[model samples]
Target chain A: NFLLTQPHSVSESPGKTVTISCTRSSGSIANNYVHWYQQRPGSSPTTVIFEDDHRPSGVPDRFSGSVDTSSNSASLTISGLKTEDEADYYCQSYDHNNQVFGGGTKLTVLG
Target chain B: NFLLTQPHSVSESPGKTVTISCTRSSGSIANNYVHWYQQRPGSSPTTVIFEDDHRPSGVPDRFSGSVDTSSNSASLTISGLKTEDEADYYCQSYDHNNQVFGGGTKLTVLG
Candidate 1:
């Protein structure tokens, strides 16, 4: 499999919330689980969200996740964004049947 | 607060196999999910495998994984390694809002 792909490269904005969507080719959304990660340059990626719509412990409430099983799309939304949120966001999927990931979305939280 | 721990680092010669183990404190292995990622210096981390013991499509067969729930350990074994396999490997786990990751194991493949 080619793995999932995020359609956009970079979505730019000021303090407005931004949404990045990840879509899978095959696999039932109801049966699939999704997660998200954030990585700044020259550092290891950190888990921001996990299990479709759950934020990991210590993660700020501004980072949110939602899944639309009907379209096999899972999205992560960052609200009240800060300059620090300007990094790469990647989506992950896992289930008994398959494991896939979207390319990633670069969120530039502009000033 | 503790995520997981991998050893300091790992090294192996080409055509040889190596194993990197991840140890976690809580969460049931049978119920929790274990995934692995590979990241080169400048590129984004890629999902090499997920859901412990399962390999995603297009991933080489040499990349194998196993979990010893009894020991609270998950191991990823890379066999017949090539220089390309030299990178950083990270272990990730998820159970509800608790998402943890290993410190990361750097694999140095030698010829």
Candidate 2:
């Protein structure tokens, strides 16, 4: 019953900032603690933001997350994008016993 | 952080069954719930199993999940597989601070 919609792709020049949004349909976003993940090609997903905006040990501060309950949306922002930051980004949340992931946004950083 | 280990790949014939395993290396499997996801080629990941054995709505009962506390392992079994069932499988778990995913198991269905 929970669904997340994300943009298919976003392209920006290196050193620029980009924000990706994941909108929830037919579910609650409050207290859900939306989690954000970065998945590079040929690799598994890695947590970039958890519990809305908390960064894990090795994640840089340039990545941040936010939640807007009114619109039932969550966002992941990448500042100072680098070549390595070009990857698929997904937003995840738990609804009762079910966990859901967004369609994912393909981030491309151009030189 | 938590770490999950999964086999690189598995193969089974159509109409047969195959099981994918995810092993935990750094955390208590019993204290935490394991989530299983399916990722099709060029598509987003979908949560098929959550909290170890709970199946989400619209997911076929052919897919089941289990957790072994002693072995610190989680498994997903797909019965009567079809061509559409061929995809990458991943297991995920959360530690107190972060969420982690397995390396992923690519399931191939042979006709």
**Best by TM-score, which number?**
2
Candidate 1, residues B1-111: lDDT per residue as tens digits?
545778868999999999999888766565777889887655557778777887776789999889887888889999999999999998887665666778889999997
Instruction: Supply DockQ values for each candidate.
Output: 0.40, 0.80
Q: Give the TM-score (0 to 1) of chain B in model 2.
A: 0.96
- Where model 2 places Cα greater than 4 Å from the true spot, the runs are none
CAPRI-style class, candidate 2 = high
After TM-score superposition, the amount by which residue A52's alpha carbon in candidate 2 deviates from its true location, in angstroms, is 1.3
Best by lDDT: 2
For model 1, give the TM-score of chain B: 0.92
Model 1 chain B is weakest, by summed lDDT over 10 consecutive residues, at B40-49
In model 2, how large is the Cα lDDT of residue B106? 96
Clashes of 2: 0
Deviation in Å, model 2, residue A53 alpha carbon: 1.3
Q: What are the lDDT figures for the candidates, one per model? A: 0.79, 0.90
What TM-score would every model get versus the actual structure? 0.78, 0.95
lDDT of 2 by residue, B65-105 (tens): 99888888999999999999999999988887888889999
